[PDB]
Each structure stands twice: as C-alpha cells, then as structure tokens.
C-alpha cells in the first residue's frame, strides 16, 4: 500500500530528485559544449542521459502506486509533467538504444524538443 510512501517522499529524497533534474541538464550541457569528443566519452554522457531518464520513470512509477492514480487526473501540473517524462523517456530510448530507426525524417526536432522539455521540469519546480 503506502508503506514505501513513508520512505520515498522523505525530504532527503526529493532534494536528491531535483538534484538529479539539475545534474541531468549539467551533463547534457557539457555534452553539447564538447562537439567532437571521444567515442567512449560520448558513451557515459548518454549513459547518464538514459540512467537519469529511467530514474524519473521509476520515480514517476512510485508516485502513482503509493500516491493514488486519481490524484493526477484533476491535476494539470502532474498530467503534463508525467507526459513530459514519458515523451523524454521514449525519445531518449530511441536516440540511444533503438537505432533500428533509419527512415527519413529530415533530422527530427524531437531530439531538440526533448532537450527543451527538460527545462520545463525545472520551470515548474520553481512554481510549486
């Protein structure tokens, strides 16, 4: 039930969670600030870019089972946010893992829109 909720919503975990929201944008910024780096170097940058995109999917998976799935429906500040996490996770899992995609798109802006949508998270955490 809500036994794990006593552990997760602890204020020592949420500071770490938002710390990760900042860390992700740090690493992703050092990534695009170093165009043309080592091949193994563009591996752990994308390593974290996926690792920190799976953490926010597990965190959003725990804020439904131990928080109530009906608290999100009438909450527009949690629908758009979960939608952003899903979109980011899908586009990241494509860009990193699933390179089977070799169909035309004219270089899709989704690799950009997701980098942009990772700012909106920080935007909404300065509004709460």
């Amino acid at each position, epitope marked *: 039930q809500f036994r794990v909720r006593a552990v997760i919503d602890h204020l020592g975990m949420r500071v770490f969670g938002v710390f990760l929201i900042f860390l992700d944008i740090i690493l992703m910024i050092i990534d695009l600030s170093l165009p043309g780096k080592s*091949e*193994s170097s*563009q*591996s752990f940058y*994308d390593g974290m870019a996926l690792a920190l995109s799976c953490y926010f999917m597990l965190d959003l998976g725990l804020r439904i089972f131990a928080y109530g799935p009906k608290n999100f429906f009438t909450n527009p500040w949690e629908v758009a946010d979960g939608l952003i996490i899903v979109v980011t996770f899908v586009v990241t899992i494509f860009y*990193t*893992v*699933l*390179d*089977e995609y*070799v*169909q035309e798109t004219g270089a899709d802006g989704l690799g950009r829109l997701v980098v942009l949508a990772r700012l909106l998270r920080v935007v909404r955490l300065a509004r709460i």
Partner: antibody, heavy 124, light 108 residues
C-alpha cells in the same frame, strides 16, 4: 558453431532470373541483419543488398535497385536474394554475411561471419 | 555518398616489416570503420572493427588506428601468410561502403 552456408549460383541467360539461398546456422536471423556483397572477377568488393527480419526494412544498391529482391524466411532461418533481369555486369561471386545490431553510439559491430561465396555467371 | 579512398593501391614489403594501409573518408564519419582481409578465392574475413577494436583469433600484429578522417590498418610484423587484399568498410546498415582495396605482396 556459427556458419553461413549459401547456394543457388550458376550460369543464367542475361535478362533471366536466379535466386540465391543463404542458410544460417548457430543464430536467430530474426534478431540480426544479413547482407549480400558480391565481387566481379578481378574487381573490388561491392555491397548489394540488406535485410533485417527484425525491423523488416530492406535496402538495395543503385546498380541492382528495381531488379533485386532480398527476402528472408525466419522459419528455416535463411535469407534469400532474388536476382531478376540479370545483366552481364552482374556476373560476380556473391557472399552473404551477418552483422548483429549495435545499441550504443559507437556502432561497435561489423560483418564478422561471412558466407562461402557462390559464383553467378550471366551469359549465353 | 561517402568516398572511401584506400591508399596505396598496392604495396610490396619484406617479412616482418611494418605495413601501414590508410583509408581516407570524404568527410567526418565517426569511427565505425572495419578492416577485412581476403585471400584469393576465399571469403573476406574480419580483422578490425570500429577502426581500432581487434576481432577474436586475429593475431597481435594487426592493429587499428583512427586519426581525423584517415583510418589506419597496421601490421607490426609482416608475415608471408599475410599475402592478401585488404578492404576498409563502414558500420550502421544501409550506409556501409567498401574501400578500393590494397594488394599486399611479400618481398623476398
């Protein structure tokens, strides 16, 4: 324990057709990717066809586009290459080779295991 | 359309020399380049993948070095059984392009 045994090559009248069979052993084709690369007598290597029954996408070279049709049967674990409207220039030795999928950003995979190579001669 | 210029066309070298075949790309194409060896009549066999990573079974003398757009197959100690032709290739499907080919001959 991984082998690509191919067959089907031979003499064939120009304009006529002929199919090459690349049988796989020791892996599931459904997950990897099979190419056809031919070589004209006393010439370089030329990539021809591609298939992956995973995604289902297929690509062809310009010199064979519209004439060649690379299929695959995961039932018998074998990739097929149908060569239609054969020209004299197609006279070459055909190899089939496997290349498994890379899921990183280095693409640290190449065509490790090749076929035996079968001779396709197009003449009258 | 990526131009793979493999230089030199052919080379002759004595046993145990340091052979260095170079494969230049028309543009920036990462570092996903292969090196194959083909003995006459046989099927091409993989030596190097990703331009520097050695394949299993391949001798120690075969090394891969990538610099700029120029990739380099290097044989430290040439052997009489290294008589073959050598090709450079690319990875990521539907974009794989072979090189011109280098014919290696043993001087003796």
């Amino acid at each position: 324990e991984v082998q690509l045994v191919e067959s089907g090559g031979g003499l064939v009248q120009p304009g006529g057709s002929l199919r090459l069979s690349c049988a796989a052993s020791g892996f599931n084709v459904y997950y990897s990717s099979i190419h056809w690369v031919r070589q004209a007598p006393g010439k370089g290597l030329e990539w021809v066809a591609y298939i992956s029954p995973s995604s289902g996408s297929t690509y062809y070279a310009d010199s064979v586009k519209g004439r060649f049709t690379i299929s695959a049967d995961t039932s018998k674990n074998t990739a097929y290459l149908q060569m239609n409207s054969l020209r004299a220039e197609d006279t070459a030795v055909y190899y089939c080779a496997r290349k498994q999928y890379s899921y990183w950003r280095d693409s640290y995979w190449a065509m490790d295991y090749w076929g035996q190579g079968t001779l396709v001669t197009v003449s009258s | 359309d990526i131009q793979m210029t493999q230089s030199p066309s052919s080379l002759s070298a004595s046993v145990g020399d340091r052979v260095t075949i170079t494969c230049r790309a028309s543009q920036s194409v990462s570092s996903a380049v292969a090196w194959y060896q083909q003995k006459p009549g046989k099927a091409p066999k993989l030596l190097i993948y990703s331009a520097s990573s050695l394949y299993s079974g391949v001798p120690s003398r075969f090394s891969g070095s990538g610099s700029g757009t120029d990739f380099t197959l290097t044989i430290s100690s040439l052997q009489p059984e290294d008589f073959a032709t050598y090709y450079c290739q690319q990875h990521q499907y539907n974009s794989l392009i072979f090189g011109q080919g280098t014919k290696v001959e043993i001087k003796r």
